[model samples]
Target: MKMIVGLGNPGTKYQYTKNNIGFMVVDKIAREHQATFKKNPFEAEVAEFFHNGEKILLVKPQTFMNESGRAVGPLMTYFGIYPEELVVIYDDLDLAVGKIRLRQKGSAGGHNGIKSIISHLNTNVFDRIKVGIGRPEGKKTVVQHVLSPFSKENQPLIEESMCQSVKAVEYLIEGHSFVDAMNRFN
Candidate 1:
């Protein structure tokens, strides 16, 4: 079994923000599979499904972005999942908007969500997909940039990247190695 965890702030207000890109990708996957997310004791919404005989859990932590690990760690322990069997998706400020980069192991690069998870898991060796959100322009602060919605001109590209991320997660569920998925999708 494997778990795909999307890091983002919860609630309708944050549903379309740039920081919620991870939530959007997993939402796409769950939608495609006709799977429904249900609240768990771990403070997360989980949707379980099978792909090619492999059980996969789609998770959205409800503890918000910075506190994501509060939800993820418990779920991981309950499911008996290892760090290697986890895939976390989150927005990245370092990469350009609408682009994605996959890495099997790395430091959080100052992403509070990733930092929280790394702290809870006690490892930085898990797989992660960084969906680019780009940096703030003009006088916009980083907080404002991440919390704001994407511009109309960038919507299509963001949608495309979400679809691509869904496919990459599927490839992993289909038993392909992380490197293979990264090579094909990154």
Candidate 2:
């Protein structure tokens, strides 16, 4: 994949919260590869790395959760990347906690981050790897639910999935097809 855009809010308040696991995975990848993030016109923190001569970019959108495409849209243009070459990793409340689902393309399912990306890019045809945060229980707003932390009971699993997500990203960047990575990881 040419770029992996991790969806989340910026700041410590959002760090480790349910919505930021996308940021968590990308952060792990950046650290593992020793890539440093720098400011960009996309309103995001960006880090670049390579595998087998193909350039890969890791992006954490600083535009916050609901408007992630503010960072993503321009970055893709400036770099000449296409929808099929991009990978977006984000939280998905529709899945079982800690489970990751890779999709070739689909609707946003009410995810504002994905919605924003679709709005800016004007297409649903893109690759995505969604890390499950699970649905909220009664009485909690969607925002509140995502803002909460993964409970102590599930922290280990979430962390493991984050690492796996990073591995999946590596597999994609290393020239294994998206279908191959999905088959291996899903």
Candidate 3:
């Protein structure tokens, strides 16, 4: 079994924000497969499905972005999934918009959501899909940049990236190596 955790804040207010790209990616996957997410006691919304005979769990932690690990850790433990079997998707400001980078393991790179997950899981070794939301423009605070919705001009890029992210997650679910996915989608 594998657990794919997409990091984002809960609620409709954050639904279209750049920070919620992770949520958007998983949401796309669930929609394509006709899987519905149901709230779980672990402070998350979860959807389960079978892919190539392997069970895959799609999780959107409801603890917001910064404390995402609080929801992820418990759900993993309860399901007996190992750290290696977890794939986290989140927005990254370092890369250009509409781009994505995959990694087998690494530090949080100053991402609060990743930091919290590293702390709770007590490790940095896990798969990750970093979907780019790009850095803030002139005069815009980093906070404001992520919290705000994308511009009309950027909508197409955002849509493409979200779709690519969904494909990357599906590739991982198909029993491919992390390196293979990185090469295929990065």
Top candidate on lDDT is 1
| Cα-based lDDT at residue 76, candidate 2 | 91
Off-target runs (Cα >4 Å) in candidate 3 are none
Clash-forming residue pairs, model 3:
none
Question: Distance from true position, residue 58, model 1, in Å?
Answer: 0.6
TM-scores of the models, in the given order? 0.97, 0.95, 0.97
Candidate 1, residues 70-176, lDDT tens digits: the string is: 89988899999999999999999988887989998888678999988988898989999999888987689999999999999889989878878888888887779
Comparing 1 and 3 on lDDT, the stronger one: 1
- Candidate 3 lDDT tens digits, 30-57: 8987899999999999999987688889
Tens-digit lDDT string for candidate 2 (119-159): 88899989999998887766888888899888787898898
Worst 10 residues of 1 by lDDT: 166-175
> Which TM-score value belongs to model 2?
0.95
Where in model 1 is the C-alpha error above 4 Å? none
For each candidate, the alpha-carbon lDDT, in order, equals: 0.90, 0.88, 0.89
